[PDB]
Structure 1
Amino acid sequence: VPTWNGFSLYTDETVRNAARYAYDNYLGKPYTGTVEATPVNFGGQMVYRQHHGLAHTLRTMAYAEIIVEEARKAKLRGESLKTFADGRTLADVTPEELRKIMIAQAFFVTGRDDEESSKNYEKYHEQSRDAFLKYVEENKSTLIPDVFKDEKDVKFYADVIEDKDHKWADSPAHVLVNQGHMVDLVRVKQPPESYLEYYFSQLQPWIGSTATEAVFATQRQFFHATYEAVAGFDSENKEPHLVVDGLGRYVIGQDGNPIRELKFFSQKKKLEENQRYMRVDEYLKLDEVQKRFPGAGKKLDGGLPGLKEYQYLQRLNSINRARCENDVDFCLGQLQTAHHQTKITPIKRAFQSSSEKARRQPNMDEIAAARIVQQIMANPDCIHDDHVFLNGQKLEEKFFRDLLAKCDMAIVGSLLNDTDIRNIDTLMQHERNTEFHSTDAKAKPVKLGETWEKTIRSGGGVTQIKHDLIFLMQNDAWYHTRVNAIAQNRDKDSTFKEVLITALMTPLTNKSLMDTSRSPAPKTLFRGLDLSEEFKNKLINQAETIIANTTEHLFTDLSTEAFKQIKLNDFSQVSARTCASTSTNIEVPRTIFGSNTIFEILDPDGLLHPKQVGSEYSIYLPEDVALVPIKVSFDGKTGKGKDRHIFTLVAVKSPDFTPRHESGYAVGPLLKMQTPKLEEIQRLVEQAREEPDLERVFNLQSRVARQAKFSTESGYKTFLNEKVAPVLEQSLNGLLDNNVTILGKVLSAFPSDGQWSAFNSVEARQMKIQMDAIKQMVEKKAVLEGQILPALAQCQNALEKQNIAGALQALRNIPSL
């Protein structure tokens, strides 16, 4: 199954011109015959060939395209398709070949003089053949050798148009033209079930059941797009079955068994006593029919969903019907829109739908990670070379990589403020000489902060800073190449600071984008990548597998297999985790950057939220949006002679695409940073463990004993012996045993200021001062070990019992000594 070159009925000018010439010189002209020569009028515009005209012709061409498309899918799914003489299959049809088919299809009905299909078949097809050759001859210089290879080639496609011997299974050419003509024959004729089953069974051997359901489902959409009525389907319908081949009937005899010789009966032939034409419901139930037709037990609604009879009938009588029959560019534009929708509809069908187009609200870790980023931005002093040290906690390379991979950094950026944006400059000043290395190894290291201040920043308020951050990531490859690789976890030999900067800048860049972007989101963006031959080939294979398992259906929904294959082959991560640069102009990645890989990202449901850059836009992929492939084309070669492919991707949002991360990664380290130092308390326990100053007590004991005894004043000597000395000996023992009971009692025994003031001697006064110091000494230990320390212990105890009102009580109600 070769890779398609992107050839399309809706973009090829050669085929489009063959459809004009056909319309312009036949087809748009009045019938010269008798049968239905009378024109019909739609919305005031006339149609000369309502039936076999332009809209019919263009649809046959459109059928051939999708029949080939579906065959290539069935082949890739492992299905065996009907082979020709040379062993080829409809899937082997080439772009060049298909173009020659459509050109011939454009003339397959030009040679009609009226609407007689019971005679003149030979003459009309001879005229169509002449009309086609006349076109080829007129544009001889153009069509050969580029379209047709020689006159023998032209003769071949003229032979298919003439249809002398009805060899409708000779070649892909004969089949596509015959099948394309027959698919348009499913309209409203009753009973609809007999017609549908017949034409279904004609196409089925060539491309398979899954592909045949897709064609007739798409055919109904092409009818809506070109304003033709669409029939309903009822497997339980009680009408008599219509044997399409010959317009006959099958009959039920009295054995109650379908008459078989199965036996064809003419609508004229008379039936016996107990004979009755088999009904369609009986026909759809036959083991042979159910085996080739999945219509049994199923139902389809006619018309358009949302429209009622009178509304649907008014639509059919619109001028747009006439425009489809008269305007080539219009009828092709209708089909193109319908064809494109059949690629998207089955995808949306296979996944849980959502009504929210916005990013979800922050989770707990995104909130925590936002707090951490804000703190780092405020304290760039916390930035080292191996790590970040912030509030008694160490954050290393692993932490910031986990943030880059688990957090939606657009959501984190929505939690940041203009203070954080202003603090970018100061981070940059702190990292003035931090070297950033481009992923291109030839490149010389660039000083981060210095380059920021010297060539990018330009003063101003916060909005200017945002523009300069967006400017840096847009225009400085030494910066963005490293950042993108670290964000997507595909980097080699990155410094911790390169990783940290990425983790800090990515949410801040998203904020800067959301705050500055003004324009409404474009719905078609282009992205350029340069991939290895090995990696691109993987993506090509994953895309083709997904496309092959995404098909429209009539009766058999294969959404479960589309789900399975998409989750197996999804490569959305290639455009995720970073501020990905895109353009509305395909020539930016294609011609300027010369990329071998081009993503045509389609976002018709507005799910990507692209922010304008400084035609550049920036994409930060939401966690639950997948970029599902619908088309893979070979686009020729780049400047360096490498193959170039375009991946057309459609944005689809679903809870099914949501990743499951285990939480805690950002909340954890945040909690540990809120941990209180409590240095006052740690200083209370060190003071409560200080040894008492006993030498001070001894010194005064000695001083008292020296004057206890060397003075002839009797009152002073007694005072020292009965009032001073015992208190000191009592205080010494108290501080030595650390006995609270003895300390708190000696407090009252300390003589008053007035008892000391009785002696106005020099030594008595100095002793007073030293006695006061000891008293303070004794008191601070009596209150600590006696009042305060017990209270704290009582407080703590009520806290581990969760008696909060009791913990406060232990501090409020302190018993006195």
Structure 2
Amino acid sequence: SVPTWNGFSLYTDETVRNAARYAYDNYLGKPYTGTVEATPVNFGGQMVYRQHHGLAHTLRTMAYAEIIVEEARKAKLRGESLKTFADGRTLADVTPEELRKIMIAQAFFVTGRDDEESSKNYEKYHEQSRDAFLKYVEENKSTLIPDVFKDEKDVKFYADVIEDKDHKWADSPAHVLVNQGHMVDLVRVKQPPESYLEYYFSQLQPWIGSTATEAVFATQRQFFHATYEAVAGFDSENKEPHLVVDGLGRYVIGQDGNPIREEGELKFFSQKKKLEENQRYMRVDEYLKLDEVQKRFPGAGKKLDGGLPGLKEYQYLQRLNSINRARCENDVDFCLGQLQTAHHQTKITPIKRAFQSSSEKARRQPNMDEIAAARIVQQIMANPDCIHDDHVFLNGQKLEEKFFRDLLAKCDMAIVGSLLNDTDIRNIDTLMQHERNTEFHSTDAKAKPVKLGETWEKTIRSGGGVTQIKHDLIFLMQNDAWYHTRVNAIAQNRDKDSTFKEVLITALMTPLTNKSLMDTSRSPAPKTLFRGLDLSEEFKNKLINQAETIIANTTEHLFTDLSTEAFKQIKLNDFSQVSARTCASTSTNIEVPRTIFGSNTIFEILDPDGLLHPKQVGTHVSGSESEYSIYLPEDVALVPIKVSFDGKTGKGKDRHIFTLVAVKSPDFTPRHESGYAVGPLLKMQTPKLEEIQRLVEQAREEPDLERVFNLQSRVARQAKFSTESGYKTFLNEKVAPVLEQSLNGLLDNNVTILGKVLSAFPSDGQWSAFNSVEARQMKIQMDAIKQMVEKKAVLEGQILPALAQCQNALEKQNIAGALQALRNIPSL
């Protein structure tokens, strides 16, 4: 039941600015022709003629009116009942046209001042102000009417507000805004601060609400800071006598501890009325502790620091005397810029206040699963043959579609891209060759399928080195919708009926595109990007409700911190994921999303803290898309601060602009389960220990005992007949024992008998004593048997036990003993 705003701002509307220029050039900037405080003042060398009631004051009143209407709208949206005027309207019902008229009036509210003089002369000063307003309208009748003011009845209405003939400060929204906007500027010069703050708070609060009113006065101190005006503190324990502002009087506390009340109702007292002994004025703290005051003023018990945080009184003071005070009091565009920046900041500080703070602006370091993901990507790219229509098969591991989608959802693919290298970028060409005939389907179901690798080879790729591949890949992202529609949809997990190779290519090309962007973009990061979306009316309206809920529960405060509810509503209504998970395309020129593509939805993404790290896409010649790409960090949220109706598209649908501020916080970090990528990588790296397999297969070989026994038969019949000097004796006495020993040793399996029977074999010199033919063959067979025993006595006796010792020394985590096991091997 609350209408959507159209983007009318004090800081962008030309008409109001023109009215403020007129007021300054005509009255504000001119010296006081009167007496009281007509003496001009100088700030850093520049003259300010009107200092308390000049340009800055007027512009601040206009800013007050803007934020009062804003906060009224938010409070009504929160369900708050607001004080109605006679026609049933609340301040929430103020139209932007009406606010423009009201602000134009606010410009002239003080023009008719001839000096600072106060109560005397009040009519005149307003009368002259009225004339100043009327004159302006007449001089610009061509423009104001009716475009702004409709009819002379309207002009006399607002002029009648300026005149203030009958002090009817609550007849209309215009009266409340002009008069209370003027009143809202009087806090600074009005000791004691607490009494005044409570008064004005009590005057505004019924119209917009306590939450809204806290927002107003907080924003006001921020405007004072913005316009180099002093900001007082606030002590609920101030002992200075309370001042009853309506009548500049006092309340009294008598002989007893009782405040003098009436028949209750506090008895008013004049200041100059000298009264009884042991009768005393009521103190500020006593006033602020009264039940009736606490029920309507949250300042009880609270303290506010004066001045600026981070500056001591000499710095604050030398700032108040800075020349920028005179530019605020003399330069309409400058004071408006100060107020615009302050007003904008009060839309961010509450958001950052509702969440954990973040000191670092850069993407986090890679984690386990991102590093593993990067490796798996590099390996798929190095060996595209692993890519099957249903799965990727790498190092004995099967990676199915869900794996790559999990990569898309759980990894910061920009970080993964940061972990890639130029050889993988080079391998894109090879991958594309492997996927020459892989059909890629646009999300436009009418458009035809496109062959990925063939289109790459024949139309996108343009030769050259890695940098040109990066610009080609980016150009594919920027130019070919059959590619980026599918890719974006898959990365954001909103795709319908996608092929496996589309998911895989999405999973590979997102980090590869991020590396391409990161490596090739040199542009300075912009702080205002525009994103165009063509959404359904139903979904856009959902976004409008979410955003307006978030905005309405994001307020500044003085005493009552509603951060918890901002947290709740932002977490319920966050739609950052609409711009997450993929290389979202943006531009610095809002006319690309608005005019070129006719989008019905525009995200005005503000990155004042440099958290989005956008990269330049393509060329930025005049007439280009001015495109930058953002891969949203996992802990950065696009929190809406403003929703504007922006008119109609070419197709006649309504167009809205959501202004989003990037806010980084651990609260936005998502909870993911480690291992989605590390697992398969570790299994891919489990070693093939073929060398040990062949070692054990070698230790499992059977000796040929048949050959040894038959060899004893050979030595026997050899020895039956003796033909050579020392052959047969030798056979009987030197060979047959080693054959019996070996056969037995082998037969037995003992390794000590084998180890020393190795020592028992004859030397080659003892055989060289015989040069017979059967002697030579005999020595060759004896060499074969010595090998057969050497294998067993070395393996079973030396190697295998040393490996057992090594293994046991490893299960005990005594590595020094494990290497001792292989190094300290006794001989046989």
TM-score normalised by structure 1 residue count: 0.89
- In the TM superposition, residue 411 of structure 1 has moved relative to its aligned partner by 2.1
SS at match of 1:326: coil
Q: How far apart, CA to CA, are the structure 1 residues paired with 2:254 and 2:697?
A: 111
- In the TM superposition, residue 215 of structure 1 has moved relative to its aligned partner by 0.9
- In the TM superposition, residue 259 of structure 1 has moved relative to its aligned partner by 0.5
> 1:111 touches 1:124 (CA, 8 Å); kept in 2?
yes
- In the TM superposition, residue 83 of structure 1 has moved relative to its aligned partner by 1.7
- In the TM superposition, residue 706 of structure 1 has moved relative to its aligned partner by 11
- In the TM superposition, residue 258 of structure 1 has moved relative to its aligned partner by 0.6
Aligned residue in 2 for 1:259:
260
Q: For residues 138-164 of structure 1, what are the alpha-carbon distances to aligned partners after superposition, in whole Å with 9 as ceiling and x for unaligned?
A: 433433443233333334333323333
Q: How far apart, CA to CA, are the structure 2 residues paired with 1:133 and 1:814?
A: 111
- In the TM superposition, residue 75 of structure 1 has moved relative to its aligned partner by 1.5
- In the TM superposition, residue 111 of structure 1 has moved relative to its aligned partner by 3.7
Q: How far apart, CA to CA, are the structure 1 residues paired with 2:291 and 2:227?
A: 36
Aligned residue in 2 for 1:172:
173
Q: How far apart, CA to CA, are the structure 2 residues paired with 1:113 and 1:731?
A: 130
SS at match of 1:343: coil
**Higher deviation after alignment, 590-599 or 687-696:** 687-696
Q: For residues 158-208 of structure 1, what are the alpha-carbon distances to aligned partners after superposition, in whole Å with 9 as ceiling and x for unaligned?
A: 332333333322221221122112111222222122221111110011111
Q: How far apart, CA to CA, are the structure 1 residues paired with 2:236 and 2:465?
A: 71
Q: How far apart, CA to CA, are the structure 1 residues paired with 2:572 and 2:422?
A: 42
Q: For residues 58-109 of structure 1, what are the alpha-carbon distances to aligned partners after superposition, in whole Å with 9 as ceiling and x for unaligned?
A: 2222111100111111122222211222322111212122122212222333
Measured on the aligned residues, the alpha-carbon RMSD in Å equals: 3.6
CA distance change for structure 1 residues 595 and 704 in 2, over 3 Å: closer, same or farther? same
**Higher deviation after alignment, 425-434 or 28-37:** 28-37
Q: How far apart, CA to CA, are the structure 2 residues paired with 1:47 and 1:755?
A: 124
SS at match of 2:299: coil
**Higher deviation after alignment, 370-379 or 720-729:** 720-729
**Higher deviation after alignment, 36-45 or 591-600:** 36-45
> 1:240 touches 1:279 (CA, 8 Å); kept in 2?
yes
Q: How far apart, CA to CA, are the structure 2 residues paired with 1:727 and 1:30?
A: 130
CA distance change for structure 1 residues 300 and 763 in 2, over 3 Å: closer, same or farther? closer
SS at match of 1:26: helix
Structure 1 residues 379-394: aligned runs within 5 Å: 379-394=383-398
SS at match of 1:630: strand
> 1:64 touches 1:180 (CA, 8 Å); kept in 2?
yes
Q: For residues 191-248 of structure 1, what are the alpha-carbon distances to aligned partners after superposition, in whole Å with 9 as ceiling and x for unaligned?
A: 1222211111100111111111111111122223223222222222222211111111
Structure 1 residues not aligned, in runs of 5+ = none
SS at match of 2:257: coil
Q: For residues 728-787 of structure 1, what are the alpha-carbon distances to aligned partners after superposition, in whole Å with 9 as ceiling and x for unaligned?
A: 999999989878799889989999999999999999988987887677567656765666
SS at match of 2:726: helix
**Higher deviation after alignment, 303-312 or 365-374:** 303-312
Q: How far apart, CA to CA, are the structure 1 residues paired with 2:672 and 2:816?
A: 41
**Higher deviation after alignment, 796-805 or 192-201:** 796-805
Q: How far apart, CA to CA, are the structure 2 residues paired with 1:673 and 1:649?
A: 43
CA distance change for structure 1 residues 715 and 79 in 2, over 3 Å: closer, same or farther? same
**Higher deviation after alignment, 694-703 or 664-673:** 694-703
- In the TM superposition, residue 11 of structure 1 has moved relative to its aligned partner by 1.1
- In the TM superposition, residue 48 of structure 1 has moved relative to its aligned partner by 4.2
Once the two structures are aligned, what percentage of the paired residues are identical?
100
Aligned residue in 1 for 2:46:
45
CA distance change for structure 1 residues 433 and 749 in 2, over 3 Å: closer, same or farther? same
- In the TM superposition, residue 6 of structure 1 has moved relative to its aligned partner by 0.7
Aligned residue in 1 for 2:691:
680
**Higher deviation after alignment, 121-130 or 385-394:** 121-130
Structure 1 residues 117-132: aligned runs within 5 Å: 117-132=118-133
Please, which of 700, 712, 723 is the counterpart of residue 712 of structure 1?
723
> 2:435 touches 2:453 (CA, 8 Å); kept in 1?
yes
CA distance change for structure 1 residues 127 and 744 in 2, over 3 Å: closer, same or farther? closer
Q: How far apart, CA to CA, are the structure 1 residues paired with 2:778 and 2:367?
A: 70
Q: How far apart, CA to CA, are the structure 2 residues paired with 1:36 and 1:713?
A: 145
1:465 and 2:469 matched: yes
CA distance change for structure 1 residues 695 and 442 in 2, over 3 Å: closer, same or farther? farther
Aligned residue in 1 for 2:623:
none
- In the TM superposition, residue 340 of structure 1 has moved relative to its aligned partner by 1.1
CA distance change for structure 1 residues 776 and 235 in 2, over 3 Å: closer, same or farther? closer
> 1:58 touches 1:106 (CA, 8 Å); kept in 2?
yes
**Higher deviation after alignment, 645-654 or 529-538:** 529-538
- In the TM superposition, residue 251 of structure 1 has moved relative to its aligned partner by 0.8
CA distance change for structure 1 residues 534 and 752 in 2, over 3 Å: closer, same or farther? same
CA distance change for structure 1 residues 229 and 680 in 2, over 3 Å: closer, same or farther? closer
- In the TM superposition, residue 575 of structure 1 has moved relative to its aligned partner by 1.9
CA distance change for structure 1 residues 533 and 699 in 2, over 3 Å: closer, same or farther? farther
Q: How far apart, CA to CA, are the structure 2 residues paired with 1:688 and 1:137?
A: 112
Q: For residues 355-374 of structure 1, what are the alpha-carbon distances to aligned partners after superposition, in whole Å with 9 as ceiling and x for unaligned?
A: 32222222222222222222
Q: How far apart, CA to CA, are the structure 1 residues paired with 2:724 and 2:285?
A: 140
- In the TM superposition, residue 376 of structure 1 has moved relative to its aligned partner by 2.3
> 1:601 touches 1:649 (CA, 8 Å); kept in 2?
yes
Q: How far apart, CA to CA, are the structure 1 residues paired with 2:318 and 2:711?
A: 119
Q: How far apart, CA to CA, are the structure 2 residues paired with 1:640 and 1:617?
A: 27
CA distance change for structure 1 residues 710 and 442 in 2, over 3 Å: closer, same or farther? farther
CA distance change for structure 1 residues 733 and 152 in 2, over 3 Å: closer, same or farther? same
- In the TM superposition, residue 389 of structure 1 has moved relative to its aligned partner by 1.7
Q: For residues 493-547 of structure 1, what are the alpha-carbon distances to aligned partners after superposition, in whole Å with 9 as ceiling and x for unaligned?
A: 2222222222222222222222222222111111222222232222222222222
- In the TM superposition, residue 35 of structure 1 has moved relative to its aligned partner by 4.7
Please, which of 276, 279, 282 is the counterpart of residue 283 of structure 2?
279
CA distance change for structure 1 residues 767 and 494 in 2, over 3 Å: closer, same or farther? farther
Structure 1 residues 250-399: aligned runs within 5 Å: 250-260=251-261, 262-399=266-403
- In the TM superposition, residue 264 of structure 1 has moved relative to its aligned partner by 0.5
Q: How far apart, CA to CA, are the structure 1 residues paired with 2:401 and 2:759?
A: 65
Q: How far apart, CA to CA, are the structure 1 residues paired with 2:687 and 2:672?
A: 30
CA distance change for structure 1 residues 758 and 19 in 2, over 3 Å: closer, same or farther? closer
**Higher deviation after alignment, 772-781 or 494-503:** 772-781
CA distance change for structure 1 residues 683 and 264 in 2, over 3 Å: closer, same or farther? same
CA distance change for structure 1 residues 128 and 791 in 2, over 3 Å: closer, same or farther? closer
Aligned residue in 1 for 2:79:
78
Q: For residues 263-322 of structure 1, what are the alpha-carbon distances to aligned partners after superposition, in whole Å with 9 as ceiling and x for unaligned?
A: 111123231233211121221121111221122222223333344444444444444333
SS at match of 1:265: coil
CA distance change for structure 1 residues 28 and 789 in 2, over 3 Å: closer, same or farther? closer
> 2:726 touches 2:770 (CA, 8 Å); kept in 1?
no
- In the TM superposition, residue 335 of structure 1 has moved relative to its aligned partner by 1.4
Structure 1 residues 535-554: aligned runs within 5 Å: 535-554=539-558
Number of residue pairs matched by the alignment: 817
SS at match of 1:266: coil
- In the TM superposition, residue 421 of structure 1 has moved relative to its aligned partner by 2.6
- In the TM superposition, residue 464 of structure 1 has moved relative to its aligned partner by 2.5
CA distance change for structure 1 residues 784 and 24 in 2, over 3 Å: closer, same or farther? closer
- In the TM superposition, residue 573 of structure 1 has moved relative to its aligned partner by 2.2
CA distance change for structure 1 residues 749 and 134 in 2, over 3 Å: closer, same or farther? closer
Q: How far apart, CA to CA, are the structure 1 residues paired with 2:329 and 2:308?
A: 20
> 2:80 touches 2:209 (CA, 8 Å); kept in 1?
yes
Aligned residue in 1 for 2:163:
162
**Higher deviation after alignment, 234-243 or 566-575:** 566-575
CA distance change for structure 1 residues 707 and 189 in 2, over 3 Å: closer, same or farther? closer
- In the TM superposition, residue 794 of structure 1 has moved relative to its aligned partner by 4.7
CA distance change for structure 1 residues 284 and 759 in 2, over 3 Å: closer, same or farther? closer
Q: For residues 596-615 of structure 1, what are the alpha-carbon distances to aligned partners after superposition, in whole Å with 9 as ceiling and x for unaligned?
A: 22111111222222222222
CA distance change for structure 1 residues 466 and 285 in 2, over 3 Å: closer, same or farther? same
CA distance change for structure 1 residues 801 and 279 in 2, over 3 Å: closer, same or farther? closer
Q: How far apart, CA to CA, are the structure 1 residues paired with 2:221 and 2:763?
A: 113
- In the TM superposition, residue 632 of structure 1 has moved relative to its aligned partner by 1.1
CA distance change for structure 1 residues 805 and 62 in 2, over 3 Å: closer, same or farther? closer
Q: How far apart, CA to CA, are the structure 2 residues paired with 1:664 and 1:437?
A: 31
> 1:188 touches 1:230 (CA, 8 Å); kept in 2?
no
Q: How far apart, CA to CA, are the structure 2 residues paired with 1:381 and 1:536?
A: 44
CA distance change for structure 1 residues 748 and 31 in 2, over 3 Å: closer, same or farther? closer
SS at match of 1:663: coil
> 2:724 touches 2:770 (CA, 8 Å); kept in 1?
no
